[PDB]
Amino acid sequence: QNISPGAEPLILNLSSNIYSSDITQQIEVMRWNFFEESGIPLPKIIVNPVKNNDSAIEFLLYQESIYKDTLIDDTVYFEAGHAEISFEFVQEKLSTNSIVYKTNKTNQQLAHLTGMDVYATTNDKITFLLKKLVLSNAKEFIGVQETRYLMDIMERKYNELVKELQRQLGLSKIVDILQRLVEENVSIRDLRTIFETLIFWSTKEKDVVILCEYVRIALRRHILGRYSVSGTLLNVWLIGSDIENELRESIRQTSSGSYLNISPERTEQIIGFLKNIMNPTGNGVILTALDIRRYVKKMIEGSFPSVPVLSFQEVGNNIELKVLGTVNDFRA
Amino acid sequence: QNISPGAEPLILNLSSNIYSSDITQQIEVMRWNFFEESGIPLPKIIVNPVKNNDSAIEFLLYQESIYKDTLIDDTVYFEAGHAEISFEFVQEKLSTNSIVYKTNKTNQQLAHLTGMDVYATTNDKITFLLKKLVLSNAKEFIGVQETRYLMDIMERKYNELVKELQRQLGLSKIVDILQRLVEENVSIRDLRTIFETLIFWSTKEKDVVILCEYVRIALRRHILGRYSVSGTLLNVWLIGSDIENELRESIRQTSSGSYLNISPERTEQIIGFLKNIMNPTGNGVILTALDIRRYVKKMIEGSFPSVPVLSFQEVGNNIELKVLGTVNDFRA
């Protein structure tokens, strides 16, 4: 009777039809990869090799189900992004907006013409899909224990900076900022730059937006790295005064959508224009001079979250940039 | 899974095609040289002798790539600065503005007519290029741990001064100043002069610019040494009232470019005039009476960062100085 997990853990209802310790190991791989990848450790997901699943695999977020389906390895998930990608590789949306390239497992001869290495098989699909779900479902993980833990971690790196931040900014300040930074899925693997930044900057600035924008600027090299395909910023498109015109001007201190939003019509019209997407493939980059980039993120949350963003103030300074165009219009 | 480096280290993706412990040793040499050279210790760069690099060498700044290329020792990097230097010795710019004299490795007979000792071979190129990249990429390293460390270091030298500074100015004050001083790559090997200076001066003055200018004056002998080639200040050129006229006058308390900048046109015009560079070789020295020398540094960041600067208030007092000229004009 005395069942005492307190908050419940992360559980994966893997079909027993598959199950191997290999998966358990793959999770360990994924977990540290997350540490590597984004600089963020992952709690262990418990494998639950449900005895009779018909290859159904279900993930439970302590324990809300997030995802179900029958993993039949007759399809693969091939996110090469290659020009050959077509219906043959259906680009399915996950709730996280990870895009899942469902391909015919037997169309590998096409995959062969490109990065066939991501032609996910049973085990890769589990791993990849999980990444596309759980790592993809970022920010959720950045809670208080996690942050404090991360602030205990790296004692050896200072520890005075670590402590100054504790002594001057405090966890609420820090947690807020980190939570905001992970929105762009910034890989925090150099937490210290953020800290080095913040201990000076945040003691002066109280604006949580600039306090992450400034930081993004400090981390600009990373950010550029995230999108500098082939050594230059890739697919860069400009959005400007169209928004400034009403929305900058109608900045209200109210943090709501109303912070900027004039009316849903302004928003709807902007989205209409967004349908005339600057990037027809969605492969970035919304370059714009906004601290209120957050709101353009909202602009693309409806319905094109797949497009990465960058503020103009974050622009690679004299960095070769592939400007491809501007919106034909976002004025109305 | 529990991968716990915290902030990631400095890694050099050296081709295995080269690799020898000699390089590891050379790094140790470079590291203390940096200590000697600039008075600043260097963290160790980890050698990563990538198995199959085609002599590609890539440096990762925890771990942002900074630099890649194929190190083929068929070229050398000869920064003699000699009059013979020509296309035969292509003076390539690194992002740091270190200039890299790519020469034909087989044109050593020209190098022979001058300081052939810097005709960098595989190992020297690695070392030299790294210096031209990493030491060249100064200031980044001057963080909190580093500063505090340096302020623990030399306990034996006072320790009261060290402590007074801790007790009166504090790390933010000190760190700021040090970070500014390293902008001119001042060799801090006599940190105590700075400290001896600051404990009095900074307790009165709150201007971070003068608080480094004053210090530069205190360190004037060094500074003169940096550029007193052949016993006199070399290639000295004067820039004056041209700037004072609008920019001193349009000092705003705003710390932005606008602190001085009238308009980008003023800036652009000044740069235009800068194209009519006072020193046709770029070999210094911008002599001018400015605390706002920082802004002339910005003036030459676009696009001639290679030229060293000196404020008039920092001028060698009755020190033989090779005045060669003035700008023909920076008035507009």
Q: Give the 3-state secondary structure of chain B.
A: CCCCCCCCCEEEECECCCCCHHHHHHHHHHHHHHHHHHCCCCCCCEECCECCCCCEEEEEECCEEEEEEECCCCEEECCCCCCCCCCCEEEEECCCCCEEEEEEHHHHHHHCCCCHHHCECHHHHHHHHHHHHHHCCCCCCCCHHHHHHHCCCCHHHCCHHHHHHHHHCHHHHHHHHHHHHHHHCCCCCCHHHHHHHHHHHCCCCCCHHHHHHHHHHHCHHHHHHHHCHHHCEEEEEECCHHHHHHHHCCCCCCCCHHHCCCCHHHHHHHHHHHHCCCCCCCCCCEEECCCCHHHHHHHHHCCCCCCCEEEHHHCCCCCCEEEEEECCCCCC
- Hey, are the CB atoms on A154 and B62 less than 8 Å from each other? no
Which of A189, A199, A200 is the closest to B8 by Cβ? A189
* CB distance B288 to B312 below 8 Å: yes
From the centroid of its chain, how far is CA B68? Answer: 21
In a mutational test of the B interface, the residue from A27, A199, A201, A217 whose CB has the highest number of chain B CBs within 10 Å is A199
- Hey, are the CB atoms on B144 and A160 less than 8 Å from each other? yes
CA–CA separation, A28 and A278 (whole Å): 39
- Hey, are the CB atoms on B1 and A32 less than 8 Å from each other? yes
Q: What are phi and psi of B140, to 5 degrees?
A: -45, -45
Contacts of A203 in chain B (CB under 8 A): 172
β-pair type (A99-104, A89-93): antiparallel
Partners of residue B13 on adjacent β-strands = B58
In B, minimum Cα distance to A149 occurs at B6
- Using a CB–CB cutoff of 8 Å, tell me whether A158 touches chain B: yes
Contacts of B62 in chain A (CB under 8 A): 189-190
DSSP code of residue A3:
-
CA–CA separation, B146 and A45 (whole Å): 39
Contacts of A192 in chain B (CB under 8 A): 6-7, 143
In A, minimum Cα distance to B146 occurs at A158
Which of B1, B64, B144 is the closest to A158 by Cβ? B144
β-pair type (B286-288, B99-104): unpaired
- For B314, how many CA atoms within 13 A lie in the half-sphere containing its CB? 31
CB atoms within 10 A of CB B104: 15
To the nearest whole Å, the CA of A268 is away from the closest chain B CA by 37
Length of chain A: 332
- Hey, are the CB atoms on B6 and A154 less than 8 Å from each other? yes
Length of chain B: 332
Q: Could you tell me the resolution of this structure in angstroms?
A: 4.7
* CB distance A140 to A96 below 8 Å: no
Contacts of B171 in chain A (CB under 8 A): 160, 164
Burial class from Cβ neighbours inside 10 Å (0-12, 13-18, 19+) for residue A166 reads middle
CA B222, B147, B298, B293 torsion: positive or negative? negative
Q: How far from each other are the two terminal CA atoms of chain A, in whole angstroms?
A: 62
In B, minimum Cα distance to A200 occurs at B172
- Hey, are the CB atoms on B176 and A222 less than 8 Å from each other? no
- Using a CB–CB cutoff of 8 Å, tell me whether B140 touches chain A: no
- Using a CB–CB cutoff of 8 Å, tell me whether A175 touches chain B: no
Which of B62, B144, B171 is the closest to A190 by Cβ? B62
- Hey, are the CB atoms on A189 and B61 less than 8 Å from each other? no
What method was applied to determine this entry?
cryo-EM
Contacts of B65 in chain A (CB under 8 A): 225
Which of A158, A190, A200 is the closest to B145 by Cβ? A158
- Hey, are the CB atoms on A192 and B7 less than 8 Å from each other? yes
Which of A35, A157, A161 is the closest to B3 by Cβ? A35
Contacts of B176 in chain A (CB under 8 A): 200
- Nearest residue to A116 (alpha-carbon basis) of A76, A162, A73: A76
CA–CA separation, A301 and A246 (whole Å): 20
Take residue B292 and report the two structure tokens written for it: 């706002």
* CB distance B295 to B247 below 8 Å: yes
Q: How far from each other are the two terminal CA atoms of chain B, in whole angstroms?
A: 62
CA–CA separation, B200 and B214 (whole Å): 11
- Hey, are the CB atoms on B64 and A222 less than 8 Å from each other? yes
- Using a CB–CB cutoff of 8 Å, tell me whether B255 touches chain A: no
Which of A41, A160, A190 is the closest to B148 by Cβ? A160
Helices A208-218, A191-201: crossing angle, 10 deg rounding: 130
What letter represents residue A82's amino acid?
Answer: H
β-pair type (A233-238, A286-288): parallel
Contacts of B143 in chain A (CB under 8 A): 161, 192, 196
* CB distance B310 to B285 below 8 Å: yes
To the nearest whole Å, the CA of A71 is away from the closest chain B CA by 26
- For B269, how many CA atoms within 13 A lie in the half-sphere containing its CB? 14
- Using a CB–CB cutoff of 8 Å, tell me whether B256 touches chain A: no
- Nearest residue to A314 (alpha-carbon basis) of A201, A179, A209: A209
- Using a CB–CB cutoff of 8 Å, tell me whether A173 touches chain B: no
Take residue B127 and report the two structure tokens written for it: 């070392």
* CB distance A299 to A273 below 8 Å: no
